[PDB]
Design a protein around this ligand. Structure first.
Ligand SMILES: [Cl-]
Ligand SMILES: [Cl-]
Ligand SMILES: [Cl-]
Ligand SMILES: [Cl-]
Ligand code: NA
Ligand code: NA
Ligand code: NA
Ligand code: NA
Lengths: 291, 291, 291, 291
């Protein structure tokens, strides 16, 4: 496995002109102390879409060099243009990332036949483990269990981050791909049911604010302490759903700032929460002892 | 709990003019021997919709009287007409059923406000535990976790059969309703993830053909043997999905007949499978050692 | 055609113990004066689901006998049980209905293969024109354009009431079935686009309150006065959507009573509107000069 | 209006290393001869996603300079990064484009509140008419009629290309935004119903192969000859749906090559059609006299 347990999809802290490197360094050290199992850098939660190429590269290399082999670092390097996914993947490989988080194409989309060629062209280009990221609610596109079955034979493709939110489809991947594909939950509110079907962890938004809970929930579940794990899941559910009340990472960045972490403003087209949803977030942060 | 583990949604075996009572008796004794935990009689799997009132009553009373207190018997008694759900519920109560399986209205539908009045009017009429049955893919209507939270305070309403297929919504019910509402999975391909979130069993189509597997999967999971339970789930997944290749109970009745159980023909508007889907079913029955 | 233009899906006015026959008579005469083209009696808008068999029969025969050949009368006679759809269809035929409104099965559902057998078994039983009613948001089930193509060859099956709300699917039916199947819009907010694709009218909820507008919108469109028709559609759109703010016929019965028509209470599981939605309805009724 | 009638979403013809400028010139002259009303350059149909920035700029400027004021030219300039949508929009403005086709954010997405800030930040930057492009099946994101109502007050925002495929939502935009927002259909199979609700044309994939049909269908409809327009729509429907059998522009580029137009290969992650779908396309091309 690239890692087991809690891999945080870390926000990118912005100053008003670029990236807050010192704040990022603080977050990285906090994650390592708090027992986060891995860092996913410049995923969707990290707003990679509104970062320039230079910012994405500086940011990914910074996380890699700061962590310095202490825990695994995974970079989001996929895009909806296959040539660009190739170039970025080779580049993060070349500077020592331990894994690649590679989203399906989105918006342009393609067929199941094109998904196979897409991911084979990216994988062929590198020698670094790859995690396929499926998130149909964002991309308009669903990579099926059959397409995944065909891809899991690839040498670098070892895992999927599964954010379809469709548990029947999760069971199908596991039954079909067996021990040739690790499953990571792509939704925090679904850690328990996914680890229960044989998943080995989560790439997590909620770990941004409670890394201990997300790590222990996985560790407990994987160790056979399924009830102790279930209770963390149920107790944090209302907070977790509050973090999805508006497009992520709007709520999780909002929350970090309410918890005095000073992580800056979102970049357009993301923006400040509306007032009613802000109040629902705060209520859940206070009930969970976070402010 | 009304029961824990595997509650079979038993087919109703039809002769060419009415109900095959002798065949039903054989099925009941087989279920008790095979360690099925409870019988759900005249649910959707039992084709209650195409049975006359007299047939529904004769059938339910027969299952109750044959079982004779050996295991719990639950009757489907709900409909999309509240007066009719009342009369049928009182009637199954009066002849000694142990639970009521009461579907949300369907087709006519109603609001969340009407769902509360619907279920309160049914419950008020009886003194028998009630299981609310939510199946939005069939009814057009989704009873939300908030509406369920309000209903679980009712004296008779103790459980939900949850066939939304939405695991996020299952977590929400459990986090919100806590120990005031038992959750039964309404989908066989989702037993593991639902028991994992605190569910206490399944009202099952797949138990019609492999009652031992469905019972042991639940017993194992609930007892902490989560891996042994997971393996039954994954091994039977392809068969289970084959049983949903056409509108249930078309495939499960088709399969029982292929396994030489002689359970008769479906009633219109259900009908014989098409040929390609029939072959996919057979392949999965043979691979699972069922024919 | 069974009729062209506006066929009202008439509410059934209830007294506190049964049916308000005098009120129904008043509504029928009002519809004929107001130039409504046809009456659909005991459809979903007429709450047939919560009427007893005797009430459904008394109600349908009353509308037929009161209208006395002045305009076409269509009865809803389908159900999700094929035997019961047969018996009811023959019965409305026998007392002189001019058309049958026959919904797809719902809740139990079936395959496309079963839909063909379902509708052939109903049609074979009668010699009265049949309108197939497709409403997947209520039934869970979508009859496809290909299945409709196969059925339109049937002698009695001449039309579809299309409430999928999917305009691409409406075009497909017309291109495929051609002049062998009349299309009626099953949504008032979609009269224009459906008549534009070759539809010949609407089976209407909004005609309950403004029969003149619904009739003229169709007459104008069919006569080539497409702009005059469009304006009625756009001006009444906000009222029309307000009539769907809660499960129909909750809002249209609520509105009739606000317009002093004294049509009684809904039957469970339908119930009174909630307050915020009630206010939105009233605002739209006042802006459209209805109260 | 920026234009009325048929605005072709022109493919970009690729050589094996870049763009086939001579082929594009031929296509442009053919469109002008064939009476196409406007050219949309580097939209989704033009595979802008897999073109470099230099290619996108060279391509857009080429179409603008070749057309040389003969008909309106609209460039796709939006992206899911607001800064990048700003820079590209200003740039196409600066070289004389007549309109901007600006998609909602996709994949990253945002709230309705962010959509307003997104589009205001793009518009504020320019003085060129803007067409908002809504395509939730591709972006994961639906701009609502209320958000559009608020934006149509903007000085540059004059239109929407509406590809939700939801005709109820089209009526809502028109009723709400009135004469402050032109509607273009974003689906060829929905030209009739959208022009019928007050739309003024289509930004079209099907115009790539039959520009005369798409132009005449609009001209006829807008001129009151609604039946003559309807017939073009119904006759071409099966071809049109065939063009959507796989992710556009896979089928339309495939078809152009079958019609001997020599427009080159698709760029990854788009790829060649599968065989069964290829045969369905060919059958429809032959039945429509195109090969
Ligand atoms: Cl997308
Ligand atoms: Cl799910
Ligand atoms: Cl239903
Ligand atoms: Cl639609
Ligand atoms: Na692999
Ligand atoms: Na209770
Ligand atoms: Na016919
Ligand atoms: Na404007």
């Amino acid at each position: 496995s690239i890692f087991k347990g809690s891999g945080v999809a870390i926000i990118t802290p912005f100053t008003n002109t670029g990236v807050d490197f010192d704040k990022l360094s603080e977050l990285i050290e906090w994650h390592i102390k708090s027992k986060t199992d891995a860092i996913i850098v410049c995923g969707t939660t990290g707003e990679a879409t509104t970062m320039t190429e230079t910012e994405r590269k500086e940011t990914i290399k910074f996380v890699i060099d700061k962590v310095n082999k202490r825990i695994p670092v995974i970079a989001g390097t996929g895009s909806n243009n296959t040539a660009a996914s190739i170039a970025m993947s080779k580049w993060a490989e070349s500077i020592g990332v331990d894994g690649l988080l590679v989203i399906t194409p989105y918006y342009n989309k393609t067929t199941q036949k094109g998904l196979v060629k897409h991911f084979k062209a990216v994988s062929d280009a590198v020698s670094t483990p790859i995690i396929i990221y499926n998130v149909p609610g964002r991309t308009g596109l669903n990579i099926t269990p059959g397409t995944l079955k065909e891809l899991c034979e690839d040498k670098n493709i070892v895992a999927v981050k599964e954010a379809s939110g469709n548990i029947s489809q999760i069971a199908q991947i596991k039954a079909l791909c067996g021990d040739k594909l690790d499953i990571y939950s792509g939704n925090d509110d679904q850690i328990i049911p996914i680890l229960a079907l044989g998943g080995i962890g989560v790439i997590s938004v909620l770990a941004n604010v409670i890394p201990e809970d997300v790590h222990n929930m996985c560790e407990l579940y994987l160790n056979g302490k399924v009830n102790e794990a279930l209770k963390i899941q149920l107790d944090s559910l209302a907070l977790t759903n509050a973090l999805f009340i508006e497009t992520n990472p709007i709520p999780v960045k909002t929350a970090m700032n309410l918890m005095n972490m000073k992580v800056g403003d979102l970049r357009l087209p993301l923006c400040e929460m509306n007032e009613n949803n802000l109040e629902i977030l705060k209520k859940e942060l206070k009930a969970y002892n976070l402010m």
